[PDB]
Amino acid sequence: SPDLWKIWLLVDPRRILIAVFAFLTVLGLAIHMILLSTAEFNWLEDGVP
């Protein structure tokens, strides 16, 4: 896209930052919890070391 900066003319680049930071945190929490649910990728109960 030659002009992608024009996105900030229709979405406020303040509530977008809050939404992005909240969204990334929740997604990051979810993926960690998904891995903890897994018998292979649970790094706290795998006994290694």
């Binding site: 900030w8 680049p13 292979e40």
Partner: protein, 42 residues
């Protein structure tokens, strides 16, 4: 207009937003490289 943001401000915000997102992606890539070295999933 819609967001009270001028064309110059949007150019300013986009440049650093891209820079911050690029650096965030860079940390993510390093994290996944370390994760792949630790325990690959594919």
């Amino acid at each position: 207009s819609m967001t009270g943001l001028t064309e110059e401000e949007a150019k300013e915000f986009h440049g650093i937003f891209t820079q911050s997102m690029t650096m965030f992606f860079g940390i993510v890539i390093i994290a996944h490289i370390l994760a792949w070295l630790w325990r690959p999933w594919l």
